Amino acid sequence: SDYFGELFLQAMRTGELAQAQQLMAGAAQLRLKYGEAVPEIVRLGRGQLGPQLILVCPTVMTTGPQVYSRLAEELDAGRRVSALVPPGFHGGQALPATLTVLVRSLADVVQAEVADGEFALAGHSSGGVVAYEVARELEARGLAPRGVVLIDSYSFDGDGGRPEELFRSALNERFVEYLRLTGGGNLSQRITAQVWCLELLRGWRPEGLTAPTLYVRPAQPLVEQEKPEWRGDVLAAMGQVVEAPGDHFTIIEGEHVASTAHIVGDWLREAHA
Amino acid sequence: SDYFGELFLQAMRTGELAQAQQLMAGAAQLRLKYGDPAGPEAVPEIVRLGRGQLGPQLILVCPTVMTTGPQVYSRLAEELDAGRRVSALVPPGFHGGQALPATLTVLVRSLADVVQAEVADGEFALAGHSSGGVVAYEVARELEARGLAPRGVVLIDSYSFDGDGGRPEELFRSALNERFVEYLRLTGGGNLSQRITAQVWCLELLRGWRPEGLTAPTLYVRPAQPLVEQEKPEWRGDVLAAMGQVVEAPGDHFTIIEGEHVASTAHIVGDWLREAHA
Question: Looking at the 3D structure of chain A, how many domains does it have?
Answer: 1
Nearest to B139 by CA among B87, B241, B214, B72: B214
**Identity of the residue in B11, B16, B193 whose CB atom sits nearest the CB atom of A3:** B193
Q: Which ranges of A141-248 would DSSP assign to H, the alpha helix?
A: 162-182, 187-200, 229-236
Phi, psi of A150 (to 5 degrees): -110, 130
Domain that holds residue B35: 1-278
Q: List, in order, residues 6 or more apart from B44 with CB less than 8 Å away.
A: B89, B90, B91, B92, B110, B111, B114
B23 contacts A16? CB cut-off 8 A = no
Q: Write the residue in B10, B30, B193 that is nearest to A16 by C-beta.
A: B30
This entry's atomic model was obtained through X-ray
Residues B274 and B154 sit within 8 Å (Cβ to Cβ): no
Say how far apart CA A182 and CA A178 lie, in whole Å: 6
Minimal C-alpha gap between A5 and chain B (Å) = 9
Residue A29 burial class via C-beta count within 10 angstroms: exposed 0-12, middle 13-18, buried 19 and up: middle
- Spatial separation of the C-alpha atoms in residues B126 and B250, rounded to whole Å: 22
- Longest CA span, chain A: 54
CATH code for the domain in which residue B112 is found: 3.40.50.1820
The CA distance from A11 to the nearest CA of chain B, in Å, is: 7
Q: How far apart are CA B209 and CA B105, in angstroms?
A: 13
CA distance B175 to chain A (A): 21
Inter-chain CB pairs, A–B, below 8 Å: 60
Report the alpha-carbon distance of residue B186 to residue B4 in Å, rounded.
20
Longest Cα–Cα distance of chain B, Å, equals 53
Please give the sequence-ordered ranges of beta strands (E in DSSP) within B113-190, or none if there are none. Answer: 124-129, 153-156
Label the pairing between strands B85-90 and B57-61: parallel
Spell out which chain B residues touch chain A, with contact meaning CB-CB distance below 8 angstroms.
1-5, 7, 10-11, 16, 19-20, 22-23, 26-27, 29-31, 191, 193-194
CB spacing of A30 vs B22 below 8 angstroms: no
Experimental resolution (Å): 2.0
- State how beta strands A80-85 and A40-44 pair: antiparallel
- Inter-chain touch B3–A31, beta carbons under 8 Å: no
Backbone angles phi, psi at B269, to 5 degrees: -60, -50
Supply φ then ψ for residue B86, to 5 degrees.
-95, 135
Q: Do the Cβ atoms of A123 and A63 come closer than 8 Å?
A: no
CA B28 – CA A256 distance, rounded (Å): 43
Q: Which residues in chain A have their CB less than 8 angstroms from residue B26's CB?
A: 19, 22-23, 26
